[PDB]
Design a protein around this nucleic acid. Sequence first.
RNA 1: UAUACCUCUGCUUCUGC
RNA 2: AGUAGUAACAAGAG
RNA 3: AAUC
Lengths: 144, 231, 96, 17, 133, 82
Amino acid sequence: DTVIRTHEYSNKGKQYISDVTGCTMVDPTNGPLPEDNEPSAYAQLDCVLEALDRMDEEHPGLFQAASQNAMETLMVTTVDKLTQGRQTFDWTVCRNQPAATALNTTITSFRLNDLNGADKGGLIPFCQDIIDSLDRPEMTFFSV
Amino acid sequence: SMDTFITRNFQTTIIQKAKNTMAEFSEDPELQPAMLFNICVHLEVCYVISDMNFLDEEGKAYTAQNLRPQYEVIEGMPRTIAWMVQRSLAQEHGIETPKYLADLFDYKTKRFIEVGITKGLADDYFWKKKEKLGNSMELMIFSYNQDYSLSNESSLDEEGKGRVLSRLTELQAELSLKNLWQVLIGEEDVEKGIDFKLGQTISRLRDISVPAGFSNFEGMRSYIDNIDPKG
Amino acid sequence: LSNAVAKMLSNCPPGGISMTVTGDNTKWNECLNPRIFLAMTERITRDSPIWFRDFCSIAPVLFSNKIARLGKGFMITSKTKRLKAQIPCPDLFSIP
Amino acid sequence: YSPTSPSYSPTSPSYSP
Amino acid sequence: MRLDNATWGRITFGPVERVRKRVLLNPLTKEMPPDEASNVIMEILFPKEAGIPRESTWIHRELIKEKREKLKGTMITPIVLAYMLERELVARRRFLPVAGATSAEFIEMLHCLQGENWRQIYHPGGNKLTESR
Amino acid sequence: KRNRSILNTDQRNMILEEQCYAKCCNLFEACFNSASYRKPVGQHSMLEAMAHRLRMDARLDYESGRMSKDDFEKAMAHLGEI
RNA sequence: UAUACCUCUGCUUCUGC
RNA sequence: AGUAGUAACAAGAG
RNA sequence: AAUC
């Protein structure tokens, strides 16, 4: 129902095929504006950027200030920060499991495909491994 | 190069520990090999002092059987392991833990030792580190030009003092032979830029993950940064 | 909210009318697009270095090409025979 | 006086001619 | 001990304007930031693991010595001692609706102090600070 | 008590996997008591840490005189294998 | 097949920010 | 049957 | 006469 209704509000957008996944994708952004009161995902990029600009004018140098605080925190953030979560999807077994386990299964699996950014302690190199793991031609994982 | 040079001179035990120490400070071994050499030489001087030296059941120095050395090598080991050893000794013998990290601890002297390697004047480098410590650790500085400046209470034996000065200039001779001595003399400091670059697959996803009227992400990045939408 | 309401109340033009719209947005998640959220980060990280810009850009890029797993499936039963069986999501179009 | 009693209340400001 | 030695006044019925101010929930033995207290706790319970000795050690050296002597002959698990110390060092400051009482030893009793349409006089026992007076 | 439904499924294998980590962690906490309180830091091996600590602990207990000549050699022998 | 009038299970056949 | 209410339970497994 |  959600899957249908999500596309029902974006059906007048641009439909294309993802060359990566090979899936059917839908893009409403910068689509034709609505002529009815039915829900609409057709949001114009300029109107967002203007409203964002208006925020930077009203609140001076908040963006670069907020970016700094987050960026500086990211550097200090350890990998174990991903343990404090709820039931997480584990790609290895394709079932929901505790975040602490779902993390451990990924670290042990990444060690086989040769991605030891997790060992360094910081989240940045572990995140650097995750985007790189897409490039690997085959991803091996333990299955007891 | 300095990279291939260290493979021939030192053993793996000194190379690994040197790289592992630099890894903690977020300093690249390969991009700064002269900085690795400073630690490699600094660890080898400390290693040889504790190698032949041992203790007995009565508790006096002798050369070699036994499973309890006379000197405890702190430099080379990781930070959290080093500071564990640092405090455990200080707390046991009953003396104040030093402000900064140490290199060696002599069980017969019951005092911390601060080792230092320098290029030119050895006596100049001795008084510089005396400012910070004062009377915390017994300093023992050495240089490559056979110029030494030991502590007031000289625990170092005459035969052992030679082995240090022997290896110091032997390496300094090997460096000058292959024209790799000029690399260590010159100054070395570069910014550790935080590297995070996107691969092939994730970049391909970001290219398609853009609004209508954009070829690739580069177009979306420049547009948001440059143009002014007001009105 | 008290102070905000006090100010938004007492700042209003005298001899006018201040009106409060008790509001709510329907189909919040179903409409909002990741590609708009991507544009938001690029604007917010304009002064910040290029490594951080690309870092913040990933999360939306992943949501932009996300895939939905359709739970367990559908259970079919004969009332006369008194039988039941789950139909896995890959076998949804196996049945007419 | 008990809190339930009316006499518990304080001798309040009363008006006079 | 504060509730034990305390004396209670009289309940007054009438309006009470309440302000929502960021107050300290529990009285501390000696206030410190999270980092500074964490190290003081380390020096007391786990000396050898502690790590790089900061100046903070020498500032609260008198507290460390005192806590060690008090936590000497106890069989209770360190993790419990650390937790109980962390309580009486790290600050617990959160927004509460108050009216003429912001001192922690009042805030801990804030439920019995006043409501919207009533007030109650309460003298908390033990000691009070000069700064607070 | 733990949910025992796992015993009947093929997930059983995770019970061993848990109790394995449990042993290691519980033995690490026996070497480093502060591990329970504040998160241990280090990019080095978990064994390397436990080795160097138990080495020092034995050496200092001997020189102080908590450890005997019978126990010290046995201790250095066992740690010698690692 | 059979053990099985036996054995195991009661949130662990998907519970997010 | 009944609970219940857009889909289940009214026992499951070796 | 606050910040934490």
